[PDB]
């Protein structure tokens, strides 16, 4: 009839997209399951158009290829878009109104007993662009749309046709075809989820595992975890790139001659390091984030005193609060302290430890070189994007620099300041949560601008002053031997007991002293000079 009696969808390749399959099955072929008599008794018409769209390389063409064989359908007629056009006058419109002849004939012959004929138009946006483009030339690019629309709308009661159109850019499709009665249902295919990536990895490595060609060491769960934003095509590319390494240990291409070890050919086996190297080669094209924050804390933590622990605990308390309660849908925090004490690192550490689904960081590095309007659009888009997922953390770094503050005018950009002021107070749509954490070093300037009323709580980050903390960081940095680390601290105790430096400057001085002369005469000289 319409679905084969022997089919369960478990065999078919497509994996990771199950909800979309159910939606398509429910809204497309459901009405053609019962005997016809019910439908007219219920006063419901059949659906005629189906549209699939998504980013490049998500699996739509695979669905189109396998649907015909999977669901006992008549061999679908497949035509690439730009193959319709032709040279002689009137040839193209004929070519379009030559595909539907079989359906018309079968309908006329057998009434409602006619089977289902399906034709799918690959690259739909190729020919059916906007029919008001203009150009003052050959109009064969317009009568094509008119012919298809005439045979799809003024069908003369053809109710046994389903057209499927797959595209990558919906915006370019002519709006006239997006209306009831013509391509009604639109299904979006997006990037897979973690469980879908495990399914894709299993499907891709099925045959490799079956023939004992994969070493037992490999663990698919770890790989699924590592590939943060890989689509299906990139996963397949990763698989074969990793296999290339294993291939290239017996056959040495270039070096020497062709030396094929006929014995290791039977022992060919992939391993984990090959997969890690393949991860090194292939890169995703989506990215967004989860790398800038990691590099922002590259130097790592040191726990040189209790203040770090207390601040981290407070951050944990706030993340717990935003995670549990349903009445607190917005929390904002300020992190302020002397310059160079280390603030962005602390915020990035808390955000990474939180483990929320959505995380991002706004810093002057990204915005550099843009025009003011571009900066405003970028900030607005980033906020709007953050308003999407159920839980969200957003970090704002060095507020004063985002506004171009220089104390000679004083000159600053008022538009950006006002946008940030209004945005930091906007609660997200219903049943969503946000945690904003912004850091600054010019507390007084923020006080003067009178934007201090939009922050719920403030956290100070005093720099270190006790020689014990200096000794701790020294031992953690492995600057010198134990005797030298003791001697430097005893000398500095009497050289300059009072101490106010920071953290960044300490590491910089440590490295410069390592390079030139690890003895006192350089490290202690610089340390005293800075303070």
């Amino acid at each position: 009839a319409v679905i084969r009696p022997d089919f369960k969808f478990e065999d078919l390749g497509v994996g990771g997209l199950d909800k979309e399959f159910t939606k398509i099955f429910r809204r497309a072929f459901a009405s053609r399951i019962f005997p016809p008599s019910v439908i007219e008794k219920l006063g419901i018409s059949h659906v005629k158009g189906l549209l699939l769209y998504g980013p490049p390389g998500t699996g739509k063409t695979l669905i189109a290829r396998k649907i015909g064989t999977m669901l006992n359908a008549k061999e679908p007629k497949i035509v690439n878009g730009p193959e319709i056009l032709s040279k002689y006058v009137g040839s193209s419109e004929e070519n379009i109104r030559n595909l539907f002849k079989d359906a018309e004939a079968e309908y006329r012959a057998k009434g409602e007993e006619s089977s289902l004929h399906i034709i799918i138009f690959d690259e739909l946006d190729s020919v059916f662009k906007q029919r008001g483009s203009r150009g003052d030339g050959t109009g064969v690019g317009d009568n094509v749309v008119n012919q298809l629309l005439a045979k799809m709308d003024g069908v003369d009661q053809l109710n046994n046709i389903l057209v499927i159109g797959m595209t990558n850019r919906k915006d370019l499709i002519d709006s006239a075809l997006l209306r009831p009665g013509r391509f009604e249902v639109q299904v979006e295919i997006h990037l897979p989820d973690e469980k879908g990536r495990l399914q894709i990895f299993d499907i891709q490595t099925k045959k490799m595992r079956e023939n004992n060609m994969m070493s037992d060491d490999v663990n698919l769960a770890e790989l699924a975890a590592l590939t943060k934003n890989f689509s299906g095509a990139e996963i397949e590319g990763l698989v074969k790139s990793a296999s290339s390494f294993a291939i290239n240990k017996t056959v040495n291409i270039g070096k020497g001659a062709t030396k094929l070890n006929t014995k290791d050919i039977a022992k060919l086996k992939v391993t984990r390091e090959d997969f890690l190297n393949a991860l090194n080669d292939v890169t995703p094209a989506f990215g967004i984030s989860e790398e800038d924050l990691k590099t922002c804390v590259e130097g790592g933590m040191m726990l040189y005193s209790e203040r770090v622990n207390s601040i981290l605990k407070n951050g944990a308390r706030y993340v717990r609060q935003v995670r549990e309660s349903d009445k607190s849908r917005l929390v904002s925090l300020l992190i302020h302290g002397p310059a160079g004490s280390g603030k962005t690192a602390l915020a990035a550490e808390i955000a990474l430890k939180s483990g929320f689904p959505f995380i991002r960081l706004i810093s002057p590095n990204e915005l550099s070189g843009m025009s003011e309007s571009a900066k405003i659009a970028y900030i607005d888009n980033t906020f709007r994007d953050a308003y999407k997922s159920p839980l969200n953390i957003l970090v704002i770094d060095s507020l004063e620099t985002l506004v171009d503050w220089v104390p000679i005018g004083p000159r600053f950009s008022n538009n950006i300041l006002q946008m940030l002021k209004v945005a930091l107070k906007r609660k997200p749509p219903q049943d969503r949560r946000l945690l904003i954490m912004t850091t600054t070093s010019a507390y007084s300037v923020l006080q003067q601008m009178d934007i201090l009323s939009c922050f719920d709580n403030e956290i100070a980050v005093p720099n270190m002053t006790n020689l014990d903390e200096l000794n701790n960081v020294m031992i953690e940095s492995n600057f010198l031997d134990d005797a030298g680390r003791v001697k430097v601290i005893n000398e500095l105790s009497r050289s300059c007991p009072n101490f106010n430096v920071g953290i960044k400057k300490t590491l910089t001085n440590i490295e410069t002293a390592r390079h030139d002369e690890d003895p006192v005469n350089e490290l202690v000289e610089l340390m005293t000079q800075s303070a």
Binding site: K87, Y88, V89, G90, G135, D136, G137, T138, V140
Partner: peptide, 12 residues
């Protein structure tokens, strides 16, 4: 400040 090209169809 615009210009335009031109294409050609053969005879039916």
């Amino acid at each position: 400040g615009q210009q335009i090209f031109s294409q050609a169809l053969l005879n039916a």
